[PDB]
Amino acid sequence: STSQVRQNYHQDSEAAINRQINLELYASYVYLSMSYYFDRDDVALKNFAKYFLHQSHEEREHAEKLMKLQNQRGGRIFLQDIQKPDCDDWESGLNAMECALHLEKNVNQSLLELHKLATDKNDPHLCDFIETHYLNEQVKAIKELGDHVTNLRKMGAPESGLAEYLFDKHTLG
Amino acid sequence: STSQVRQNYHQDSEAAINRQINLELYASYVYLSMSYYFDRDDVALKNFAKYFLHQSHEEREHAEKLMKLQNQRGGRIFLQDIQKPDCDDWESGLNAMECALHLEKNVNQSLLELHKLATDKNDPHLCDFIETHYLNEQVKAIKELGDHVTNLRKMGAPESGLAEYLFDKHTLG
Amino acid sequence: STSQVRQNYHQDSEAAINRQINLELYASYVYLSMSYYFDRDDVALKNFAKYFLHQSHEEREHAEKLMKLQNQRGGRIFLQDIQKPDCDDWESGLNAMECALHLEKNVNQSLLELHKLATDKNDPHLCDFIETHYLNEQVKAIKELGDHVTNLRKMGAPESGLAEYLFDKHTLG
Amino acid sequence: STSQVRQNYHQDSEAAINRQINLELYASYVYLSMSYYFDRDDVALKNFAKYFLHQSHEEREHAEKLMKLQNQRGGRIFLQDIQKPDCDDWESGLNAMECALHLEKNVNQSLLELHKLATDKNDPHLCDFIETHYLNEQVKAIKELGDHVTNLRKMGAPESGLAEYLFDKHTLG
Amino acid sequence: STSQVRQNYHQDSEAAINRQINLELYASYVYLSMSYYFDRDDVALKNFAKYFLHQSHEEREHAEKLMKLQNQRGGRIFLQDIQKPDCDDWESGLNAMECALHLEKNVNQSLLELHKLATDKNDPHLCDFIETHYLNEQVKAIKELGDHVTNLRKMGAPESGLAEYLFDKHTLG
Amino acid sequence: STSQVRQNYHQDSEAAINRQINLELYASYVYLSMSYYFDRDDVALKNFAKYFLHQSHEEREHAEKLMKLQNQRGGRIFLQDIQKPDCDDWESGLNAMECALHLEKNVNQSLLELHKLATDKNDPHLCDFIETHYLNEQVKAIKELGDHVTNLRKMGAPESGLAEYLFDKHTLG
Ligand SMILES: [Mg+2]
Ligand SMILES: [Mg+2]
Ligand code: NA
Ligand code: NA
Ligand code: NA
Ligand code: NA
Ligand code: NA
Ligand code: NA
């Protein structure tokens, strides 16, 4: 039953990796939802749409990198349903950015727990994988989203549609 | 409630489009599952893996094009859960190709039903969209998969691991 | 007696590093043996030979990088005899790949123990050195060797000399 | 009061980061002092001067990278006075190199303590930041300075002004 | 005790030069503080941050040019502590620009006093050094900062976060 | 038992070739030891280190060329342990060069005996192999090492660390 390549790879780590794959695919789908919300004719913030579509594709890449890890270590990928996002309508550029920030922080929390599990199972390969490819990426993503939220709020989002328009143009464009 | 852009776009067409978006995302996820099955150390058919990863990404693009259509016509996208694929283990290159063929034919059946609905609702824009971007793509995809299945079977797949190896190399490589 | 550069570098870490240098040189010599086995006129698998010669040279590089580490930290290199490989005759491409996989897993086990020692001695520099340069390299090497072994077996190695011939051509060539 | 981006970032880590920023700025100022000592008409070792000016600028960059970290994690930078170096007159190329070595080892000790704190607070992001950007840099810097000191001493520094002249020319030039 | 190069270089001029070096290093550190204030996630004015980081680096260059002067004339550099800036929190883009203007005017006042001292000691070399490298630079810097402050105020800074956002984009970006 | 390619290749020649392979691998390991001795922080002669690392790699190439010969003639390679060098500490650049000269002369002596054996067994192919690839190489290597030793001694090595420094720079650099 054991993969010929498997070495120092705990079943709990394999299970946590599968959970993280699902979480990354969920995040990708959330960002997809936000992108096409901004593509609506009654929202019409093209650069918000592009920003979130980019984020969605990046999240898919993260999921695929975790799947690659799973196979590299000799674990077995078990996919689950990708839950629909909590929203169909994201209300505003600012609200979408706030939801993105919350999502990224939740993903980061899951990564930190994954790292803690790896550490407890003395899996330095897994630990350094997470550190190299995920943790810093998360920190950057959270910082960027915080900057966006701060700027939008200072500009007067979401009540100033001029605010969101000009943010779309000058920051995301 | 009606989008300012909406014209000659039936609610039933909007609903069918949402169903098709979900189906395309499902197909993408199925192909993703197959790709990383072939990336397993105990399967190790890299070009099968690449082929299915490519198919997964193409399916995601098809879904995004349908979402774009939905917004273009003034419909509203409603996302649903993306169901996990029926399999974790696809057994063989031949079996995966057969499942892909079955999937593509099911998607094609759904597209033909969508076209029938569009025709009944006298929506020539939607009909042409499906014809131009989806129907011929499906016919080509089905023909290619049928060619793959035929070749694999003639070569002696799935019992001839040499068969699958050489197919991976010479057709998909 | 203490090197002017030495800082947070435990004697046990220095000793384990010397052991790892010897192990890397041993692995290099093993791969050299396999390469020239495949260069024999009665084996004549040129791309197997090239593959293992490449592996031998890579192993020498790994050993030299550990020696560089030892000097960087102010430890002192103590070289030992490089034991001859367990085999003169590696029997087949498949058998050689299986022995390579076993060797790489043993080296990986030694690296993991080295990491554990570093961790226990609170030597984060050493830990991240191992993580960055060795652990992922090992995981990749093991995965590749597992793929090779899987493919060879599925093709019918080692009884199908056609199998090994075609693997030599299409994968390693 | 808590930054919107802050996650898994302990107050003690923030405080230690501020201490490290100050230490890096101090080191930069020390190297600046040494550079312009070697620019004196009665010392006149241009390549020593360039070497230490380079080191000063590198130290400033390290400090700025720590400040960037602090903001990335949502901590708040608190700057302190940058203490003047212990010397105005560094006496010789050899003495300056020895003081630089001592300084670099002290900075390294502070980095190791920072890492230990990060580890204790289970901050893998901070740990890998230190490992990636600082620890190896320190090891290299210490090794280089040790090489310089060794060479100078063997050449006959600081009593052989010919020694320092030729070292300036051939190593640092 | 007298440098072999020293000629027409008064001790009071040497002392005033050392004071100016310290002042330039202080200004550099102030600008550094402002830069990373604007890099905070709750401020998030990237082009303000870049502007002040640039100013900090320029101030470092000014200090180094004065140190070079000191050595050229045969005076001896005596470094002092670099005092921390008066603020950790610069409150707004406008407030930071106003503080920068005040700082630049104080540095200019110190340069004018240095020039007056040079004149009184009949040190035309020192006088023309100050005139060529510093005085016009100061006049330009003050004019630019005044323009920034004027623009920000007219735009409605600091109460209009839109004001600061758009200034960051269009003037400093 | 006899290789299909074997012709005019005496068992004694095959045995002597295996001995020479081991000797070449030993010499490569000796040179490796010397290289990293010169990489020590308390020796710090980078160009000595590079010179000996180059020699080590060349020796490995010589060994591989002999292994290739063995297979070309239809003999069978039998590897032995590679003995550790007689020294961990090579004391000085001059001492290392003297040991290298002694080593090269011993290898040359072994090559001459190999040639004599070939001649006695009327193996002109083997004779001309040795003549073409090894004997002249040895003569050149010995002459170069003698030049190095002569220069070092005349410069005042090993007591003049300035001597070794400047030799490292001007001859080996
Ligand atoms: Mg790490
Ligand atoms: Mg004038
Ligand atoms: Na992610
Ligand atoms: Na499709
Ligand atoms: Na290795
Ligand atoms: Na530093
Ligand atoms: Na200035
Ligand atoms: Na040789």
Q: Find, among A19, A49, A20, A46, the residue nearest to A33 by Cα.
A: A49
Do B60 and B54 touch, CB atoms closer than 8 A?
no
| One-character DSSP codes across B7-74 | -S--HHHHHHHHHHHHHHHHHHHHHHHHHHHHTSTTT--HHHHHHHHHHHHHHHHHHHHHHHHHHHTT
**CB of C3 closer than 8 Å to CB of C11:** no
Cβ pair B17, B78 in contact under 8 A: no
Separation in Å, CA B31 to CA A33, B53, B112, E162, F64: 21, 6, 22, 47, 47
Phi, psi dihedral angles at A114 (to 5 degrees): -60, -45
Question: Sign of the CA dihedral A148, A150, A151, A152?
Answer: positive
Sort out which chain B residues have CB atoms less than 8 A from A70's CB and list them. Answer: 36
For residue D55, what are the β-bridge partners?
A: none
Which tokens in the block code for residue A61? 């890449």
Question: Mapping DSSP to helix (H, G, I), strand (E, B) and coil, where does residue D26 land?
Answer: helix
* Distance in angstroms (rounded) separating the CA atoms of residues F4 and B140: 54
Q: What is the rounded distance in angstroms from the CA atom of residue E14 to the CA atom of residue D51?
A: 26
Could you report how far apart the first and last alpha carbons of chain D are, in Å? 52
Cα-based distances in Å from F92 to D144, F45, F96: 20, 10, 6
D61 and D95 Cβ atoms separated by less than 8 Å: no
Integer Cα distance of B62 and B25 in angstroms: 8
Calculate how close chain D gets to C77, using CA atoms only, in Å: 16
Other Cβ atoms within 10 Å of B127 Cβ, number:
18
Residues of chain D that touch chain E, judged by Cβ-Cβ distance less than 8 Å = 3-5, 25, 29, 32-33, 36-37, 39-42, 53, 60, 64, 67-68, 70-71, 74, 76-85, 88
Beta carbons of B161 and C170 less than 8 Å apart: no
**CA nearest to B158 within chain C:** C154
Tokens of C31: 């791969």
- Measured between beta carbons, the chain A residues lying within 8 angstroms of B67 are 32, 36, 39
Contact between residue E52 and residue E96 where contact means Cβ atoms under 8 Å apart: yes
| Pairwise CA distance, residues C88 & C30, whole Å | 9
Q: Which long-range contacts (CB under 8 A, 24 or more apart) does E108-115 make?
A: E108/E135, E108/E138, E108/E139, E108/E142, E110/E19, E110/E20, E110/E23, E111/E20, E111/E135, E111/E138, E113/E16, E114/E13, E114/E16, E114/E17, E114/E20
DSSP 8-state secondary structure symbol assigned to residue E43: T
Secondary structure letter of residue C84 according to DSSP: P
Q: State both tokens at C75.
A: 């430890």
Give yes or no for a contact between E37 and E104, defined as CB atoms under 8 angstroms apart.
no
How many A from CA of D130 to the centre of ligand 6?
Answer: 11
**Secondary structure of C26-45 in the HEC alphabet?**
HHHHHHHHHHHHHCCCCCCC
**Contact predicate F111/F130, CB 8 Å:** yes
What gap in Å lies between CA C145 and CA C126, rounded to an integer?
A: 27
3-state DSSP: chain D helix, strand, coil percent, rounded to 5? Answer: 75, 0, 25
Between CA B126 and CA B132, with CA B131 as vertex, the angle to 5 degrees is: 100
Closest CA to D8 of A139, B120, F133, E10: A139
User: Cβ atoms within 10 A of the Cβ of D86, count?
Assistant: 10
Radius of gyration of chain E measured on its C-alpha atoms:
18
Please report which ligand is nearest the Cα atom of F64: 8
CB contact under 8 A, B41 and C166: no
Q: Which ligand is nearest to the CA of F56?
A: 8
β-bridge mates for residue C82, sequence order: F82
- The H or E element that residue D10 is part of is none
Reference E173, options E75, E66, E54, E90; nearest CA is E54
User: How far is D161 from D168, CA to CA, in rounded Å?
Assistant: 10
- Cα B132 from Cα B129, distance rounded (Å): 5
What value, to the nearest 5°, has the Cα angle with vertex B28 and ends B25 and B33?
Answer: 130
CA–CA separation, D75 vs D68, rounded Å? 10
Q: Which CA distances in Å does A125 have to A3, B112, C96, C122, F80?
A: 17, 49, 26, 17, 35
Q: Determine the 3-state secondary structure of A82 from DSSP.
A: strand
Nearest by CB to residue C125, choosing from D135, D145, D150, is D135
**Distance between CA atoms of C10 and C16, rounded to whole angstroms?**
10
Residue D124 CA, ligand 1 centroid: distance in Å: 8
Q: Which residues of C touch A3 (CB under 8 A)?
A: 146
Cα Dmax for chain A: 61
**Rounded-to-integer distance, Cα A153 and Cα E44, Å:** 11
Calculate the dihedral angle through the C-alpha atoms of D27, D28, D31, D32, rounding to the nearest 10 degrees. -140
- To the nearest whole Å, the CA of A1 is away from the closest chain C CA by 15
Under 8 Å between Cβ of A29 and A82: yes
User: Is residue C67 a contact partner of residue F40, using CB atoms and an 8 Å limit?
Assistant: no
